[PDB]
Amino acid sequence: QGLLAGKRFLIAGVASKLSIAYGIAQALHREGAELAFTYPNEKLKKRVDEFAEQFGSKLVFPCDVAVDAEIDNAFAELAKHWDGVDGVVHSIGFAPAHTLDGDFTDVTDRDGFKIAHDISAYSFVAMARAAKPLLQARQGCLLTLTYQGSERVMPNYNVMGMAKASLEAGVRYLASSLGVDGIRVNAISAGPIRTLAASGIKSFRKMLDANEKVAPLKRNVTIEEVGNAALFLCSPWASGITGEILYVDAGFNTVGMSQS
Amino acid sequence: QGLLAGKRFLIAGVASKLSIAYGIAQALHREGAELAFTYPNEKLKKRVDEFAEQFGSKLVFPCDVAVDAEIDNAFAELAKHWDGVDGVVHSIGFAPAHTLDGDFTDVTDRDGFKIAHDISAYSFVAMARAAKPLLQARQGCLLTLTYQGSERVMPNYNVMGMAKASLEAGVRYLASSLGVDGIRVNAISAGPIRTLAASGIKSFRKMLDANEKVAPLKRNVTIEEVGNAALFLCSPWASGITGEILYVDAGFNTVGMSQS
Amino acid sequence: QGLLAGKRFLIAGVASKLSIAYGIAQALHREGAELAFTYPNEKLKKRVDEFAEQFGSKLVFPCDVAVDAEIDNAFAELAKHWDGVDGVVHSIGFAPAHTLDGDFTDVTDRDGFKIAHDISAYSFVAMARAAKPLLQARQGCLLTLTYQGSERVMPNYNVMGMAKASLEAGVRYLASSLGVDGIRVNAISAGPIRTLAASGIKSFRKMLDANEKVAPLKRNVTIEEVGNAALFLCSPWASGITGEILYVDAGFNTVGMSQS
Amino acid sequence: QGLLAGKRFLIAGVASKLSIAYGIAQALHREGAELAFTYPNEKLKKRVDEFAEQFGSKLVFPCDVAVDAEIDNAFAELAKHWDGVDGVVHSIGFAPAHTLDGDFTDVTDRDGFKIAHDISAYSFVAMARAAKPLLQARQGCLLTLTYQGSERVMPNYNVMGMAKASLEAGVRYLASSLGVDGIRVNAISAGPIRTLAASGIKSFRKMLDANEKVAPLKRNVTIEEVGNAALFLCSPWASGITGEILYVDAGFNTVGMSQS
Ligand SMILES: NC(=O)c1ccc[n+]([C@@H]2O[C@H](COP(=O)([O-])OP(=O)(O)OC[C@H]3O[C@@H](n4cnc5c(N)ncnc54)[C@H](O)[C@@H]3O)[C@@H](O)[C@H]2O)c1
Ligand SMILES: NC(=O)c1ccc[n+]([C@@H]2O[C@H](COP(=O)([O-])OP(=O)(O)OC[C@H]3O[C@@H](n4cnc5c(N)ncnc54)[C@H](O)[C@@H]3O)[C@@H](O)[C@H]2O)c1
Ligand SMILES: NC(=O)c1ccc[n+]([C@@H]2O[C@H](COP(=O)([O-])OP(=O)(O)OC[C@H]3O[C@@H](n4cnc5c(N)ncnc54)[C@H](O)[C@@H]3O)[C@@H](O)[C@H]2O)c1
Ligand SMILES: NC(=O)c1ccc[n+]([C@@H]2O[C@H](COP(=O)([O-])OP(=O)(O)OC[C@H]3O[C@@H](n4cnc5c(N)ncnc54)[C@H](O)[C@@H]3O)[C@@H](O)[C@H]2O)c1
Ligand SMILES: Cc1c(CN(C)C(=O)/C=C/c2cnc3c(c2)CC[C@@H](N)C(=O)N3)oc2ccccc12
Ligand SMILES: Cc1c(CN(C)C(=O)/C=C/c2cnc3c(c2)CC[C@@H](N)C(=O)N3)oc2ccccc12
Ligand SMILES: Cc1c(CN(C)C(=O)/C=C/c2cnc3c(c2)CC[C@@H](N)C(=O)N3)oc2ccccc12
Ligand SMILES: Cc1c(CN(C)C(=O)/C=C/c2cnc3c(c2)CC[C@@H](N)C(=O)N3)oc2ccccc12
């Protein structure tokens, strides 16, 4: 009987044990919560399926946010199992890798632009919509994962900075739209962490050595710290907070410039 | 021989004499600038043609930013007449009217989302791409028109707030990509102004009366003030300014709350 | 002893049961923490003495933040009782009441400015300094209470918005200075709450009805919501968070404007 | 007959020809404006006299902003000569040198804190107060100089970041207070420039070499660019802009991190 004793949460975005969604579910489950999970397609089905079993869960549903139907169906199927929900966790983001390696103006084609904002920004809205009925039942909350690359230019993040900026806008518009139903909508601007989202980025290690050099805490954050922060926002202790972007980056965002 | 004696500028987004692009072109031409124009489709050709000649210009090219080819071709044809360019003004934006009338989570369908970010956000980048060669010739600048609904939730702006947030992020990513070539990329966060962008918005009228009550200057801004500010950002006096979001809103953005 | 099992915390700024520090101390003690308290002068001593005892504490020390000596003594005396500290909560703020009633520029005198910035902004730094030794012992954290009037113009806040702006800056400079010692420095930007800080503000009730009308959650925050958030920032779950300004305002900060 | 034909502006803060105030006066005077000048004390009197003489001005008044009388007197004396004013330029800032060399928590004593916010933050309000009557005559404007060190932690800026945060807050509270009378209150967040404000800072060259390495334009800004930007804000072209913090930093503020 911890903090989330009796609470339910759906965790979309578990791709590996390094995924941020993993540390969240772990932190949430640690406090007594019951978890549900989605996977983008069959290839991930079996992996997410027993990630669920780690958390005492057998609720694993296919949800490709690119498909409108999959979203509603994934929530249709979930309505079949659960009465309501105390929160939905959206840890999804993607852009064609070519748009993230090279010059912004060059690699940012129309299609690469379309994909980035659809999967990474609109999905949180489409999910929030399909998830709205179940969230109201328990005055649940909504949580997404953003990155300060929306507010500040990082090399090679490119259209993902545009997407995250759009996402952050959606959080405010969702929190404002869903605030009347007791549904808090918040986001976490988490520091850089080497997950499966770092594959293909040749500069990452230098970037990590760099973030380590600038962060006020002189270190990079972990999915546990992120998970605990997510755990808080999804908790009754975070009842008075909506539309907030919380920076779990070791204060990195607050530094103008560091010793050479 | 005024301030822009001998400078050239392409004005995309002139649809009538109310268009913000119109008040900008007015300010530029007033200071000796040379003007070129595009139109979204044939229906506007004769109207833009008519405005172009009004400013001593006969350079009018079809440019539907939804079409990749139309963008580059409009710039291909423009290269035939002009050597280089000192600045590109991006006053274009659009989202399906249904996505701008009603509840955010509800009315924001996937397609309305795609269109909003495509026409209003990606186009400035695609244009920025197609315009680079002419900009490099004269170390021109880039200017777009944003709205503070990206930073704060306004009713009925909905997916346009996500788009403008993406746009404003792109400005930073563009200014950073094109900064090594002397090309300044900036944006103006202009106060609300009753142009053809207000068609279909039933609440616009009350919205305008509100800004009037809150803006520190107790008034709404004009396309002249926006045009005069745009004229400046496109001017050598703004040489030490890139990636800047300039708020020409009579200070409304800086007010937390006003007398009841 | 749940989250704050075995932790010690000094709470300066307990003036009544409505004080934000009160709801904070409540949340901390609720989670098993041992509490210490300061009082500004003799008149409050017996109340703070009594306030400490409500939380199983008899460690009550005089701390007038205007006096450098009074500051250090309270921590000298505290050093006598406690080895180290897991966090210091700075819930202090003050400006001459005249500076908060009328137009900002008329009422903003030099001394009212001096007092406001002295007591409300420098105090967190002087305290952070005198408290540094005890924080290093346990790598404690620092927490202060800010107000969004620093980022946005509210009527009658006047020099307190300038002071809060300085304070919020100090948090970043403190978090960066004390971050190498494991001391996270954060702040909570709490929504408006009718505490003893509302005495003399004739407009409070209308303002409270206003935030109630604007906050996405359609309500005003409580010292419990504020206290729980402080509990988090003072908790190991907030280990990856420093220099952060956390908004416990029911998302009010995220609303550009709502139907009036 | 340029842009400021017939406009008057007072330039407080001219200490040398490198001072930002100098490049502004030059830019304003270049466009036909008439100039007045103050000096902090006797030692600078003859020097300010000489610069005023450069700009066709012999209006030089003693103004130590630390003395309330000097402020009002300087404006009393100025009111005698000029009818009204189209703008007041506040280019003053100071903090005890000891508070700007070392660790923030250490060197920030109570007095060093008092002085910094007094001279650098309160002066703009006291001057804005003493300047209000002359500004109303011509619907003048107010301009101050801020630094992004208020929003982000720079090494050794320390308490000056708190002051700049207060200063920047005052701009909004001033712009909001004076906006109803047509007086626009704005500020320029100018990049680092080696003026007489850099004396005693051993780290400057590395800091400057860094900004040069990070600034999107790969260069540092000049007082001419700042002066031209100030000229704009003090101009009718900036009529729709109040309470705005304009970043003349070569876009440096918009960069999260650069190639190592
Ligand atoms: N890794 C970082 O440094 C970082 C920092 C800040 C924010 N974020 C964001 O946090 C979120 C989680 O990233 P991560 O670190 O866990 O990497 P990850 O690859 O381990 O997890 C991201 C998940 O998005 C899923 N996904 C992608 N496309 C999908 C689709 N069409 N339908 C359904 N699911 C889809 C992926 O399957 C994956 O599980 C992302 O949005 C990311 O942008 C990441
Ligand atoms: N009108 C306001 O209140 C206001 C305030 C602040 C910012 N803005 C934004 O600044 C810009 C100024 O717009 P405006 O005031 O001149 O209104 P406007 O309607 O007159 O101009 C918008 C132009 O975008 C063009 N356009 C739309 N879709 C296109 C496409 N697929 N291809 C090519 N062109 C296309 C339209 O033809 C139009 O000329 C807009 O982006 C607007 O969102 C508007
Ligand atoms: N109530 C709100 O709406 C609100 C919202 C956001 C932030 N805050 C801030 O929270 C903090 C606590 O205020 P509150 O709302 O709990 O009201 P409060 O009156 O109960 O507490 C204010 C505290 O300021 C302390 N103080 C003042 N001068 C002092 C001195 N010279 N020496 C030592 N201590 C001194 C006092 O100990 C007092 O307890 C304030 O800084 C306030 O600005 C308040
Ligand atoms: N140097 C930069 O990079 C930079 C950038 C942005 C803003 N600023 C700030 O804007 C202003 C521009 O500074 P600068 O570059 O011209 O350096 P500067 O040293 O040449 O000018 C500072 C002036 O403030 C005057 N002054 C100091 N104390 C005073 C007092 N008690 N009363 C009256 N006057 C007093 C000084 O005499 C001096 O003329 C400063 O406040 C500065 O902090 C500086
Ligand atoms: C930091 C940082 C991140 C992590 N992060 C904040 C994200 O949101 C990550 C988005 C992201 C989306 N799509 C991707 C990839 C990543 C690469 C995985 C690959 N498998 C792929 O095809 N597509 O990504 C970066 C990219 C460039 C520069 C910096 C960063
Ligand atoms: C403010 C404000 C604006 C002006 N503004 C800042 C914009 O950027 C306006 C974008 C906008 C894009 N697409 C539109 C329309 C407008 C309506 C024209 C119609 N013809 C249409 O089909 N599509 O529009 C609003 C809409 C709803 C709520 C508030 C606002
Ligand atoms: C909101 C809001 C607050 C609460 N809050 C966020 C604060 O930070 C409160 C500061 C504050 C500082 N000093 C004060 C007082 C208040 C009045 C108590 C009295 N005892 C006094 O002498 N001095 O106060 C306001 C004042 C004017 C307008 C709005 C507000
Ligand atoms: C950058 C940067 C600046 C320039 N800048 C933006 C400012 O506003 C500088 C204000 C400033 C105020 N007071 C000062 C001094 C400067 C040193 C002159 C000396 N004579 C003194 O006693 N007092 O100053 C810095 C100080 C430390 C670290 C970095 C910087």
Please report the two chains with the greatest interface, counting residues with C-beta closer than 8 angstroms to the partner's C-beta.
A-B, 41 and 41 residues
Relative helix content of chain A: 40-55%
Order of helices and strands of chain A: EHEHEHEHHEHEHHE
Number of domains of chain A: 1
What ligands are attached or bound here?
Answer: nicotinamide-adenine-dinucleotide, ligand NQF
Number of strands of chain A: 7
InterPro entries (chains A, B, C, D): Enoyl-ACP_Rdtase_NADH, NAD(P)-bd_dom_sf, SDR_fam
GO biological process, one term (chains A, B, C, D): fatty acid biosynthetic process
Keywords (chains A, B, C, D): Fatty acid biosynthesis, Fatty acid metabolism, Lipid biosynthesis, Lipid metabolism, NAD, Nucleotide-binding, Oxidoreductase
Site (Involved in acyl-ACP binding) (chains A, B, C, D): 202, 205-206
Architecture overview:
Four copies of one chain form a homotetramer. Chain A has 260 residues and is α/β, with parallel strands linked by helices. Chain A has one domain. Chain A has eight helices and seven strands; from the N terminus they run E-H-E-H-E-H-E-H-H-E-H-E-H-H-E. Chain A has helices spanning 20-30, 42-54, 68-81, 104-107, 110-137, 159-178, 204-214, 223-233; strands at residues 8-12, 34-39, 60-62, 87-90, 141-146, 184-190, 245-248. In chain A, strands 3-2-1-4-5-6-7 form a seven-stranded parallel β-sheet, sandwiched between helices. Chain A is globular and about 55 Å long. The A-B interface holds A 68, 103-106, 108, 110, 113-114, 117-118, 121-122, 125-126, 128-129, 132, 150-153, 158, 161-170, 172-178, 243 and B 68, 103-106, 108, 110, 113-114, 117-118, 121-122, 125-126, 128-129, 132, 150, 152-153, 157-159, 161-170, 172-174, 176-178, 243. The complex binds nicotinamide-adenine-dinucleotide (4 copies) and ligand NQF (4 copies). Residues 93-95, 97, 100, 147, 154, 156-157, 160, 192, 197, 199-201 of chain C line the site of one copy of the ligand Cc1c(CN(C)C(=O)/C=C/c2cnc3c(c2)CC[C@@H](N)C(=O)N3)oc2ccccc12. Chains A, B, C, D: One of its GO terms (molecular function) is enoyl-[acyl-carrier-protein] reductase (NADH) activity.
